[PDB]
Amino acid sequence: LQDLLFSDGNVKAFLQATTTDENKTALQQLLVSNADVLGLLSGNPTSDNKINLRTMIGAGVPYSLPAATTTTLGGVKKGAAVTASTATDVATAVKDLNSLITVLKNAGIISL
Amino acid sequence: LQDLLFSDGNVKAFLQATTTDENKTALQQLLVSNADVLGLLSGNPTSDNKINLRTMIGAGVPYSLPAATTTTLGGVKKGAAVTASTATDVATAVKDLNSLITVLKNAGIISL
């Protein structure tokens, strides 16, 4: 009787409660007009759909913290411990300054 | 007449335009074959469905920037201000080096 009453085969499969993946694609298209949402409903959105779906919900991509560069904000590693200076001569004061410089160089806080 | 024409109860509920949550689960299964997409359509995907849905669209999880460790890339906090050195003796030069070391230690740029 459903064959006598309905022409569309995707509708008929829905009414029989047995749909193929192709029937589901067509039925999704009857229910939703946004192309990026249709991409989501397929379970296999295109690259363009993915970008647009994130825009649609205001979502970001997985963020990876980059190392600091001389031009670009980034993360650093924390420098090793450095002892306060008790230098009473120039040679030692210079030794202590250099220890700080190397620590900052080691942590990528300053350039080589 | 629909009772005389169709055997499937979930199809019949669809044709009456009145579906329960159970009818909707069954109708989803007639329309879509991918198990992870069926999880999404339920509104309550399992843990496995969630992982697979993200894979399906190439999405990442919420990213949290970890602190730098000696083995693993991470973020740092920016060090406090440090004055350029005008030291003319060793004691002062060492004092200034140590000030840099403590600043880098305070910001977790180098280890204690």
Author numbering:
A (entry chain 7c), B (entry chain 9P): 170 to 281
Text of the article:
The bacteriophage ϕ29, a representative of bacteriophages with a short non-contractile tail, has an ~19 kb dsDNA genome encoding ~20 proteins. Both 5ʹ ends of the genome are covalently connected to the terminal protein gene product 3 (gp3). ϕ29 infects the Gram-positive Bacillus subtilis cells by injecting the genome–gp3 complex into the host-cell cytoplasm using a short non-contractile tail, leaving the genome emptied virion on the cell surface. Here, we report the cryo-electron microscopy (cryo-EM) structural studies of the ϕ29 prohead, the mature and the genome-emptied virions at near-atomic resolutions up to 3.2 Å. Our results show structural details of the complex capsid, the DNA packaging motor and the entire tail machinery, and provide a molecular basis for understanding the assembly, maturation and infection mechanisms of the bacteriophage ϕ29.
We calculated the cryo-electron microscopy (cryoEM) reconstructions of the ϕ29 prohead, the mature head and the genome emptied head to a resolution of 3.6, 3.2, and 3.2 Å, respectively. Our results showed that the 448-amino-acid-long polypeptide chain of the major capsid protein gp8 folds into three structural domains: the small N-terminal helix domain (the gp8-N-helix domain, residues 1–61), the central HK97 fold domain (the gp8-HK97 domain, residues 62–347) and the C-terminal immunoglobulin-like domain (the gp8-C-Ig domain, residues 348–448). The total 235 gp8 subunits assemble into a ~520 Å long and 400 Å wide, T = 3, Q = 5 prolate icosahedron of 30 flat hexameric capsomeres and 11 concave pentameric capsomeres. Structural comparisons using the HK97 domains showed significantly greater variation in the hexameric capsomeres than that in the pentameric capsomeres (an average r.m.s.d. of 2.2 Å vs. 0.6 Å between the aligned Cα atoms of the corresponding HK97 domains of the mature head capsomeres). With the cryoEM map of the mature head calculated at a resolution of 3.2 Å, we determined the structure of the pseudo-hexagonal base of the head fiber (residues 1–110 of gp8.5). Six β-barrel domains from three gp8.5 monomers form the pseudo-hexagonal base of each head fiber, which interact with one C-Ig from a pentameric capsomer with a contact surface area of ~620 Å2 and two C-Igs each from a different hexameric capsomer with an average contact surface area of ~400 Å2. Further analysis showed that the icosahedral end caps of the mature head expanded slightly upon the loading of the genome. However, structural comparisons of individual hexameric and pentameric capsomeres within the icosahedral end caps showed a similar average r.m.s.d. of 0.4 Å, indicating that the expansion in the icosahedral end caps mainly occurs through the rigid-body movements of the capsomeres. As have been shown in the head comparisons, the E loop in contact with the pRNA has an outward shift of ~3 Å in the mature head. In addition, we did not observe any pRNA density in the 3.2 Å mature capsid map.
